[PDB]
């Protein structure tokens, strides 16, 4: 009876592991004698735990190693594991202890380098600059990191290493594909969460005896699952990089299966509706994009709201959103030789979001071309002037608080921006869908084998709250006719 969680991440196409990958586990002790991980696991000779049995200490870590690589109930059956002990027998560690841990992994790699590394951090503390920093340096070293979202029924951005954008952050869903509710508490959520995975009622190795098993739940277990999927993917394609892998996870997850009613109203659009899965069979080039949301700006006269991509990604377009709709729009601006998406707030506005479309386009140099506010009869226009450049998005911001084909068309009083990228082998098309006045949502989707790179409402609008991509669907929220405009591209 294959466990639900294993059924769930498996896609309908299978054949009835993670051999050449190493997965480091920063948690409790583990019982390496257990028949589930017997042969898989190597205890590293590292400890850093705070002051406070044989079974209970091993309890947590043993179960998680099982999920990752366990013979009967694990994801990456051929994975090789290594446990660093940074939590004590009550599950409690220190930030310094984790830092020394992470540093021990990097020195280990430097001394005996092996193949691709996966580091699993099934712990959370409060937001920590230093812990997020250390993670960021380790990711730039080339090590893939997976962390638990946290079990506090709260915004993941308030927790570390969850809040660290480099780390892959994983929330927990149950067998109903719903967010886990451990008592009053439960899975964390929000924009710092990358995807969700099985994390309720997960059968796994128990420390009580060498052939014992037990159900545990948490965002730890969810994390463990994706660590296993990472290992699988990385074994199959060892030349993959962190950015590549994060995009593939997102691409191959189940979409729109989480009932988002369980999240707080403010956090729904922010929380990605994705549940982890292994890729299907044959994969071999493809254009991958994801939506990066900013934090809510703050209610003041001028919006400090920024969305950033990762170093290796290109910002292909930029939109914005507000619950009220009071907003001055968005612009893309260069920052440290890399484009960022910035949204502005209106006088009445309670605050805005900046939404960024980040894509893996190994080609390069995505520039911004802006035209200033022009005139009535004209409107406002920008096109890509660069050699062999394609238009991938159209932003538009304006100064006046009071509202009133190869190029971007904008309002007479609006300042319009065009994102252009050097992608001579990428063709792009526009697609749109217009609906009469009193509707509140309007969507358009790119067809099979195309990627959505820009999403916007038709410039001659009426009452629009904002626009944003959700996977490959462009969504325009509203309160003549309102019309969604999507720019789709492929190789």
């Amino acid at each position, epitope marked *: 009876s294959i466990p639900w969680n294993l059924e769930r991440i498996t896609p309908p196409r299978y054949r009835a592991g993670g051999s050449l990958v190493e997965v480091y586990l920063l948690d409790t002790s583990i019982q390496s004698d257990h028949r589930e991980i017997e042969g898989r696991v190597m205890v590293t000779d590292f400890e850093n735990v705070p002051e406070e049995q044989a079974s209970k200490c091993d309890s947590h870590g043993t179960h998680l190693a099982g999920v990752v690589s*366990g013979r009967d*109930a694990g994801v990456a059956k051929g994975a090789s594991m290594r446990s660093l002990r940074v939590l004590n027998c009550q599950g409690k560690g220190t930030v310094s202890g984790t830092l020394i841990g992470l540093e021990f992994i990097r020195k280990s790699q430097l001394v005996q380098p092996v193949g691709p590394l996966v580091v699993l951090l099934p712990l959370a503390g409060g937001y920590s600059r230093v812990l997020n920093a250390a993670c960021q340096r380790l990711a730039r070293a080339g090590v893939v990191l997976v962390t638990a979202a946290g079990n506090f029924r709260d915004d993941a951005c308030l927790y570390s290493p969850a809040s660290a954008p480099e780390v892959i952050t994983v929330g927990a869903t149950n067998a109903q594909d719903q967010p886990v509710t451990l008592g009053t508490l439960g899975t964390n959520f929000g924009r710092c969460v990358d995807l969700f995975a099985p994390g309720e009622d997960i*059968i796994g190795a128990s420390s*009580d005896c060498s052939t*014992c*098993f037990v159900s545990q739940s948490g965002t730890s277990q969810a994390a463990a699952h994706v660590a296993g999927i990472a290992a699988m993917m990385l074994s199959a394609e060892p030349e993959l990089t962190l950015a590549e892998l994060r995009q593939r996870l997102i691409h191959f997850s189940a979409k729109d299966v989480i009932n988002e009613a369980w999240f707080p109203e403010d956090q729904r659009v922010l929380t990605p509706n994705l549940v982890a899965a292994l890729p299907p069979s044959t994969h071999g080039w493809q254009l991958f994009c994801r939506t990066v949301w900013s934090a809510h700006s703050g209610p003041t006269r001028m919006a400090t709201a920024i969305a950033r991509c990762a170093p290796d990604e290109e910002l292909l377009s930029c939109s914005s959103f507000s619950r009220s709709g009071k907003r001055r729009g968005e612009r893309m601006e260069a920052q440290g030789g890399k484009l960022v998406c910035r949204a502005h707030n209106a006088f009445g506005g309670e605050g805005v979001y900046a939404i960024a479309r980040c894509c893996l386009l190994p080609q390069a140099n995505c520039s911004v071309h802006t035209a200033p506010p022009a005139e009535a009869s004209m409107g406002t226009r920008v096109h890509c002037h660069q050699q062999g450049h394609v238009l991938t998005g159209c932003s538009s911001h304006w100064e006046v608080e009071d509202l009133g084909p190869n190029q971007c068309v904008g309002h007479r009083e609006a300042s319009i921006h065009a994102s252009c990228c050097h992608a001579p082998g990428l063709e792009c098309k526009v697609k749109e869908h217009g609906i009469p006045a009193p509707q509140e949502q309007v969507t358009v989707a790119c067809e099979e084998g195309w990627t959505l790179t820009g999403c916007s409402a038709l410039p001659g609008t009426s009452h629009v709250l904002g626009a944003y991509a959700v996977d490959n669907t462009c969504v325009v929220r509203s309160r003549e006719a309102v019309t969604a405009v999507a720019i789709c591209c492929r190789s």
Partner: antibody
Amino acid sequence: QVQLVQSGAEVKKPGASVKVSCKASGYTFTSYYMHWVRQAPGQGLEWMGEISPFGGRTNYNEKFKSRVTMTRDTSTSTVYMELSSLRSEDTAVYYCARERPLYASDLWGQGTTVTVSS
Amino acid sequence: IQMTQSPSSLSASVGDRVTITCRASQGISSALAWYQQKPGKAPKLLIYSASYRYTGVPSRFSGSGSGTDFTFTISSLQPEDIATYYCQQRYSLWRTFGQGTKLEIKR
């Protein structure tokens, strides 16, 4: 397709020995432990011992430790079991079964009937 | 470890609930499996880890328990269930079966 097939029935004289074969098919033979349990006509199931996949290390029940000997064969994916100093009480059906960590030995052999008689 | 299984035999009529207990000499967490033996055939694994039913095993069958105190149950008895049922303990080095419970369909 997945199956354990074991050797046919045999007679042996009191004192003699017998090697019962048991061959794995369909699955990775090297992934699990292999158990032997027997059943006398009037008794019920009695556990003999087990042999691990890695290193062919073994562990036997204390009732048989002096007599029983188990051994695997990597190439042909088959596990053997030899019992010596055969007495009347050894007349039984002998089963091999793969045991996995979670799914406590889900796949069994057909049984091999052994008869100790003159 | 010592596995005391009871009753040694049980005659029940079709549609009846049937309970078999199984008591270890010491606490074995949940390292317990139940098997069914049809006469002539080898034992078939029914329940593993004390609670979980194996694939292609009717959902009439179920198990529960932890530590020293386990039970196996047929929710509704059927003719196909004529067999001898054994609990196996797998907590220690050596494996131990219970004595066995023989089912008879009362008719």
